[PDB]
Write a protein that binds this ligand. Structure first.
Ligand SMILES: Nc1ncnc2c1ncn2[C@@H]1O[C@H](COP(=O)(O)OP(=O)(O)O)[C@@H](O)[C@H]1O
Ligand SMILES: Nc1ncnc2c1ncn2[C@@H]1O[C@H](COP(=O)(O)OP(=O)(O)O)[C@@H](O)[C@H]1O
Lengths: 209, 209
């Protein structure tokens, strides 16, 4: 209920995606197809593709489930398909390597269903202490876990962060100022990229409040 | 000869994606799945998804071919697959509606192979004079054709724009300053987002010069 949060800007996204692409250039891995993990990897994938000169980008949606009693986590490809990717070199891309569960599944899935010559994985960020698996490439190493708010995720992240606060509330009527206070106290954010009243209005429409 | 080029910033991308999402909210179209047209629609798709609250994003790669003698254009899905999307409402997303050839194909493809309850199309921008088809939703109407440099496309676009200049060199050469003045002369860009020497270095590595 008190969470380290880092707001990531577009400029940083560009800077990261570019640095990630540089490593891949320098390693001279010739990428024929990029497989983006949706939704997190879509944006980083397009950027890396721009820098490297990759024209074929495909994507697979990975869901993240938890079993209520056991707290067992299971990553799972939603809407699975197969394509013939032989004689092609695949680069899989995601936003961040946190646990490594998703890039583990993706590599495995891609190798069984797409049948590429080679597969390498790449994420913008990589959390050393938390990652069971290390991606072939990453732009930035994180030695201390935090939640990273990406510029393409601001709405959803803020909705969740706000909700964590509202489910412990004096209740029902929402003082925007108390909320703003709590957001600073809990996450360290004085100035959310999306203003909190816009967030609240949206949570209402999505009837979460 | 001159090409009208407009450089589009991330802030504008955000502003557009958001406005596009607002239209869709206001029309009360309940989107279950977003199908992004790769590569152009990937980024806009992630953003619209953030704003609307859509969790499932799939993508199909559309290629664009021209036959050399007839100048006949043909859009074509590369790496086709099928998934069962029945009882779902699909939103297809691309960056811009220029000719309409790609969103025409995507709509037709998605309805034949995915079998959704309903399909609607949406792009950030829409060029009135050029579009044979009009997307269900768009953020911005363009009444005068130009080429839009998107922030996820800066490298590739500049590589091409530079190459259009280099293939009419007077001599085997490449004075960076000549290039810079030609770029202003031809496209109206004094300050390309990626500096032109970086572009040249990259064209060399890609064996284009
Ligand atoms: N610390 C974090 N900051 C931002 N997003 C995260 C973080 N941890 C997980 N996520 C989101 O959850 C998804 C799955 O996480 P995980 O299964 O650990 O991925 P990976 O296999 O890349 O480590 C990521 O693609 C990302 O969108
Ligand atoms: N004026 C333009 N500015 C930027 N990109 C363009 C333009 N026209 C075409 N493109 C690129 O070419 C792709 C295909 O164009 P087109 O077949 O006309 O698409 P649509 O079916 O969306 O009109 C687009 O997704 C876009 O990436």
């Amino acid at each position: 209920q008190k969470i380290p949060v880092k707001v990531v800007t577009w400029d940083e996204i560009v800077s990261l995606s570019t640095k990630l692409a540089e490593k891949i250039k320098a390693d001279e891995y010739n990428v024929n197809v990029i497989v983006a993990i949706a939704r997190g990897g879509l944006v980083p994938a397009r950027l890396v593709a721009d820098v490297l000169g990759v024209f074929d980008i495909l994507s697979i949606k990975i869901e993240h489930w938890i079993e209520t009693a056991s707290h067992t986590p299971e990553a799972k490809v939603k809407y699975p398909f197969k394509v013939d990717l032989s004689d092609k070199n695949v680069l899989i891309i995601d936003d961040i390597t946190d646990t490594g569960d998703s890039i583990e599944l993706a590599r495995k899935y891609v190798m069984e269903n797409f049948r590429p010559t080679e597969v390498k994985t790449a994420t913008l960020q990589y959390i050393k202490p938390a990652a069971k698996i290390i991606p072939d490439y990453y732009a930035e190493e994180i030695v201390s876990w935090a939640w990273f708010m990406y510029p393409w995720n601001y709405w959803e992240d803020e909705i969740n962060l706000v909700n964590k606060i509202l489910i412990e509330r004096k209740t029902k009527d929402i003082d925007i100022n108390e909320l703003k206070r709590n957001f600073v106290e809990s996450y360290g954010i004085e100035n959310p990229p999306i203003s909190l009243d816009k967030i609240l209005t949206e949570m209402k429409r999505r009837k979460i409040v």
